[PDB]
Amino acid sequence: QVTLTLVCLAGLLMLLTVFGNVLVIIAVFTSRALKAPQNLFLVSLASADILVATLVIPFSLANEVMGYWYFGKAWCEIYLALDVLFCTSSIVHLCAISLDRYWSITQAIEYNLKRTPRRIKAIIITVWVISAVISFPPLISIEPRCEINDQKWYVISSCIGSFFAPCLIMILVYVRIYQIAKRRGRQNREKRFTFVLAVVIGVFVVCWFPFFFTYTLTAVGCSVPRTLFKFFFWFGYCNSSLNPVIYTIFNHDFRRAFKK
Amino acid sequence: LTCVTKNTIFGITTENCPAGQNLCFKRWHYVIPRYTEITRGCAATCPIPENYDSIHCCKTDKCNE
């Protein structure tokens, strides 16, 4: 009965994730308050990355329920690489949006025309390429069961290049943005977008922080309770579903588009 | 005997163990796809693999690594 309960819970999580991300993509690609602005393309892509991250959740679910790998060595390698890639891609996408905001806030002094779609698409391609090349090389460098042939170096490299380094980069970027704004009534579209993005960053950090923290701890040499560690591992996949709720709660026109 | 006890970053510790637990066991318990905990220690002959987990059993000195 436990197996059925876990399978149903994970299936509902997958369905909610896919539904929310499809709705977000449609809303970004429809209406006028969302389609006309160009910054919403980054949001649409983050939605797409979360959406495609539902070919990873079912395989981890199958591993948990069965207790052994049932897909082959090559698929095990592909699953590991792509599972790392998706979380790394999401966090580096948040970092890229923050960096684009920082660049824009410091470029208006030198004037800028309306070439934004080219810049947005360039960032789109660049962040995916960086996410691939910051995750695959460490993986390729290092009764069936899907394993990691680790010498305790892949854990540190993965956590540093996936969680800690982008977190430090975004902390520095937003400190610089705050200082610039401090040096330099109603709310604007840009203010709403920045607030929604900041709430998304907070949600992502508070969700993925426990798992990467205890992963670093296991690298250092501290044992971890197994059930708590599995819950922390799945709580990031829960974050995947939580993100569209953050979009639909704190921004009204997204809610109107979802209703339509 | 004098086999590896703690193996991770920041040094690898090789230690002995009291008599009656001379042999060295290295038990692998797999939590998620990307975490396979290893426990290296001493035992009389070798302990049991509960929950169907791989456990290598060694009689010589320094076999667990």
CATH number at residue A44: 1.20.1070.10
| Subunit contact A152:B36, Cβ cutoff 8 A | no
**Which range marks the domain in which residue B31 is found?**
3-58
Cβ–Cβ of A230/B10 closer than 8 Å? no
Decide: residue B39, CB within 10 A, 0-12 exposed, 13-18 middle, 19+ buried: middle
Would residue B18 count as lying in a domain?
A: yes
Helices (H), chain A: 2-28, 40-52, 57-66, 73-107, 116-133, 136-141, 154-159, 165-183, 189-220, 226-249, 252-259
Place of tokens 């970027």: A173
Amino acid (1-letter code) at residue A86: F
Nearest to A122 by CA among A42, A200, A48: A42
B33 part of a folded domain: yes
Contacts of residue A64, defined as CB under 8 A and 6 or more positions apart, other chains included, come to A6, A230
Give the experimental resolution in Å. 3.4
Among the partner residues B7, B33, B36, nearest to A63 by beta-carbon distance: B33
Q: Which amino acid is at A202?
A: G
**B21 in any annotated domain:** yes
Asked if residue A216 lies in contact with residue A159, where contact means CB atoms within 8 angstroms, the answer is yes
B28 vs A127: CA distance, rounded Å = 37
Measured between alpha carbons, how far is A137 from A76 in angstroms, rounded to an integer? 16
Taking an 8 Å cut-off on Cβ atoms, the answer to whether A76 and B7 are in contact is no
Asked whether B56 and B45 are in contact (CB, 8 A), the reply is no
Q: How far apart are CA A189 and CA A35, in angstroms?
A: 13
Find, among A233, A218, A242, A256, the residue nearest to A63 by Cα.
Answer: A233
Nearest to A219 among B8, B31, B36 (CB): B8
CB under 8 Å to A106, separation ≥6 — which residues? A180
Give a yes or no: residue B64 inside a domain.
no
Separation CA B36–CA B53 (nearest Å) = 10
Instruction: Report CA torsion sign: A169, A49, A86, A243.
Output: positive
Q: Give the one of A80, A223, A229 whose C-beta lies nearest to B33's C-beta.
A: A80
User: Does residue A216 contact residue A152 with C-beta atoms inside 8 Å?
Assistant: no
Q: Exposed, middle or buried by CB within 10 Å (0-12, 13-18, 19+), for A97?
A: buried
Cβ contact B42:B25 at 8 Å: yes
The tokens for A251 are 């921004």
Give residue A211's domain range. Answer: 2-259
Q: How far B52 CA lies from chain A's nearest CA (Å)?
A: 9
Query: What Rg do the C-alpha atoms of chain B give, in angstroms?
Result: 12
B25: which strand partners?
B41, B57
Whole-angstrom CA distances from A2 to A58, A149, B19 are 16, 31, 43
Cβ of A223 under 8 Å from any chain B Cβ?
Answer: yes
Q: How many domains does chain A have?
A: 1
Question: Structurally, how many domains does chain B consist of?
Answer: 1
Which DSSP helix (H) or strand (E) runs through A250?
none
Interface test with B, best of A229, A231, A232 (most B CBs within 10 A): A229
- Please state the φ and ψ torsions of residue B28, each to the nearest 5 degrees: -110, 115
d(CA B11, CA B13): 6
Q: What is the largest CA-CA distance in chain A?
A: 67
Assigned token pair, A212:
């990467």
Answer for the pair A52, A88: CB distance below 8 angstroms, yes or no: no
**A133 class by beta-carbon count within 10 Å (0-12 exposed, 13-18 middle, 19+ buried):** exposed
Burial label, A134 (beta-carbon count in 10 A; 0-12, 13-18, 19+)? buried
Determine the Cα–Cα distance for residues A124 and A229; give it in Å rounded to an integer.
33
Sequence-ordered list of residues with C-beta below 8 angstroms from that of A128, at least 6 positions apart, any chain = A89
- A:B CB pairs within 8 Å: 50
